[PDB]
């Protein structure tokens, strides 16, 4: 029952160590220019907002309204959808995967620093995703609550290596990347929730990309700061980000049935348009537009070479990786754990 | 609408920086000493285990049946279950709280060390405990879901400081005294829903304490093997989170209408015997008991004083706080957020 485990050495501590002060230093910033992109709790939606509530007499007709209507959404989307339940449901991860970032530690779980109240903060507001999605697959009985935790348990044991080396720099530019990704995903499940006829998964779904949003405009501009402060090594860690692709946060899915768990995942995601390689291309596509690295100048010999690279970069992708629909054209049917080894197309 | 922080200030690494050599060694001792109590994924319960099943027509009447059985179960107990699930909730916490322990660090989210391994995959089974008790709530309709799940973003944004400064000498003995005392805690929380009339909700609970319970024994394993490696220096540290004064790691709890939530939580965790100050006492002296911290001979004079210090403190916590079950006998009437401000005795 051997889970995956990554197939890269270990790279910890890849940045100049002095380092730390160019993020000691940009406390005061941080705090008036990303503790911002936080709604104060009390102004935050809860899961509890979308749910049947359990303390109305209402709470019948709701949880009954709300499997019927899941019934005419098909059994590829709620595959879909249940990647990213899993995804989200993984956070404890993502905490210590910020918290290896050597500029912008927590250090003692409560530290006062900017960066850690931003982390706790943004964790706070992520974890949320998980009780939500969660409670509304539980509701619907369409999926296997059952083995789908137990991928949770598999994946939470394993991490994962995004390949930062506990570089401030490497990881907030894979966030400000993975950040928009999970938007796009979230908000074609969206859409697609709601051309099935279901308003209210929708609604779910609407709402969490509206926060990833909200994230990805912070953690852009961490990384557009850092563009004015060290305009070579930002682009240097940049197109190191790029050579290395950007693996996706659950890449070890584990059900204890299938060694492709994520393969297969992500070729169902891509048949139904909810994250396709063609998405990937737009991404970093925006994030060259946003960043303004095209209008970069006076850059190292190293610098120049990194930027060249990661701005014709999404044409190239865009063709490679267009080729990988006339390959969703006729693909074979395949069961899934997660929905009682029914068979979705891959 | 402003939470609470904590009142000591900021101590991080305060252990001989070189000693993360004794910890880098007992890598293979710990392969073969702690992960053993680890479960492998495929032999352990998932939260499916204990709730209605939803893809099944038994779906109905088990819900059903089971807010019905809630309904027999008084307010008090409810704030009691309801603060266990928020900690148990705050889980990312927790991880990172580990996370930042010098020597047993992970460095990159999926480090093949042992401690790490250990670290993820105890993660993971503690994850669980948050889904399932949640699941539980929501279903009773007791509760308010959206006041309980807003003091959970109150809670993961400001962490906790349990005074461990990244020490994994002070960080295993403090999880090692926490973990004993959610087992106790679980124990009666499983007992009263017992008495209650309520097996379902008692079997959800003796499970987690049985988790809590394999953890302990690792944990104290962990610290016990330092008493052999550095006898001096780990009753040091040990002296030294007594002086402190264990505080539970949800102890900046807040709801937006309470000031004194964990105050006022613990008052009737106490009043109800789930966790009593008496309790406390037992945890400090079952663990002198079980490290043989009693019989340790040739410390240095500042060990010896932190021996006697340990060693005698027991019986006088039972005295002193044993006078605060007569301030649960005529105390006040008072509402929580968590159970649509209705009111509990303190
Ligand atoms: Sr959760
Ligand atoms: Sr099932
Ligand atoms: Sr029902
Ligand atoms: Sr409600």
Same mark, same amino acid.
């Given at each position: %029952?051997?889970?995956?485990?990554?197939?890269?050495?270990?790279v910890?501590?890849?940045?100049?160590?002095?380092?730390?002060?160019?993020?000691?230093?940009?406390?005061?910033?941080?705090?008036?220019?990303?503790?911002?992109?936080?709604?104060?709790?009390?102004?935050?939606?809860?899961?509890?907002?979308?749910?049947?509530?359990?303390?109305?007499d209402? %709470?019948?007709?709701?949880?009954?309204?709300?499997?019927e209507?899941?019934?005419?959404?098909?059994?590829?989307?709620?595959?879909?959808?249940?990647?990213?339940?899993?995804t989200?449901?993984?956070?404890?991860?993502?905490?210590?995967?910020?918290?290896?970032?050597?500029?912008?530690?927590?250090?003692?779980?409560?530290?006062?620093?900017?960066?850690?109240?931003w982390?706790?903060?943004?964790?706070?507001?992520?974890?949320?995703?998980?009780?939500?999605?969660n409670?509304?697959?539980?509701?619907?009985?369409?999926?296997?609550?059952?083995?789908?935790?137990?991928?949770?348990?598999?994946?939470?044991?394993?991490?994962?290596?995004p390949?930062?080396?506990?570089?401030p720099?490497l990881?907030?530019?894979?966030?400000?990347?993975?950040?928009?990704?999970?938007?796009?995903?979230?908000?074609?499940?969206?859409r697609?929730?709601?051309?099935h006829?279901?308003?209210?998964?929708?609604?779910?779904?609407?709402?969490?990309?509206?926060?990833?949003?909200?994230?990805?405009?912070?953690?852009?501009?961490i990384?557009?700061?850092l563009?004015?402060?060290?305009?070579?090594?930002?682009?240097l860690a940049?197109?190191?980000?790029?050579?290395?692709?950007?693996?996706?946060?659950?890449?070890?899915?584990?059900?204890?049935?299938?060694?492709?768990? %994520?393969?297969?995942?992500?070729?169902?995601?891509?048949?139904?348009?909810?994250?396709?390689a063609?998405?990937?291309?737009?991404?970093?596509?925006?994030?060259?537009?946003?960043?303004?690295?095209?209008?970069?100048?006076?850059?190292?010999?190293?610098?120049?070479?990194?930027?060249?690279?990661?701005?014709?970069?999404?044409?190239?992708?865009?063709?490679?990786?267009?080729?990988?629909?006339?390959?969703?054209?006729?693909?074979?049917?395949?069961?899934?754990?997660?929905?009682?080894?029914?068979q979705?197309?891959?």
């Amino acid at each position: %029952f051997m889970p995956p485990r990554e197939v890269h050495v270990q790279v910890t501590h890849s940045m100049p160590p002095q380092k730390i002060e160019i993020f000691k230093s940009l406390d005061n910033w941080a705090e008036e220019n990303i503790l911002v992109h936080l709604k104060p709790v009390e102004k935050c939606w809860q899961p509890q907002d979308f749910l049947p509530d359990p303390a109305s007499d209402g %709470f019948d007709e709701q949880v009954r309204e709300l499997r019927e209507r899941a019934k005419e959404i098909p059994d590829d989307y709620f595959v879909v959808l249940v990647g990213d339940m899993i995804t989200e449901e993984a956070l404890p991860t993502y905490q210590t995967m910020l918290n290896t970032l050597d500029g912008v530690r927590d250090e003692t779980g409560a530290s006062p620093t900017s960066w850690a109240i931003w982390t706790r903060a943004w964790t706070a507001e992520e974890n949320r995703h998980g009780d939500l999605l969660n409670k509304y697959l539980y509701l619907s009985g369409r999926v296997d609550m059952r083995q789908i935790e137990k991928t949770i348990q598999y994946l939470i044991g394993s991490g994962m290596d995004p390949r930062t080396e506990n570089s401030p720099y490497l990881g907030f530019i894979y966030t400000s990347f993975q950040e928009r990704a999970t938007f796009i995903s979230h908000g074609n499940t969206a859409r697609q929730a709601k051309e099935h006829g279901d308003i209210k998964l929708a609604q779910i779904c609407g709402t969490i990309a509206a926060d990833e949003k909200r994230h990805e405009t912070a953690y852009t501009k961490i990384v557009e700061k850092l563009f004015e402060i060290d305009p070579d090594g930002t682009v240097l860690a940049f197109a190191d980000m790029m050579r290395k692709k950007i693996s996706m946060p659950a890449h070890l899915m584990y059900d204890g049935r299938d060694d492709n768990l %994520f393969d297969h995942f992500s070729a169902v995601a891509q048949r139904l348009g909810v994250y396709t390689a063609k998405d990937y291309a737009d991404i970093l596509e925006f994030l060259v537009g946003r960043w303004k690295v095209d209008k970069l100048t006076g850059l190292s010999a190293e610098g120049q070479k990194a930027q060249d690279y990661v701005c014709r970069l999404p044409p190239r992708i865009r063709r490679l990786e267009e080729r990988a629909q006339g390959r969703a054209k006729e693909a074979p049917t395949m069961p899934f754990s997660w929905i009682f080894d029914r068979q979705v197309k891959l």
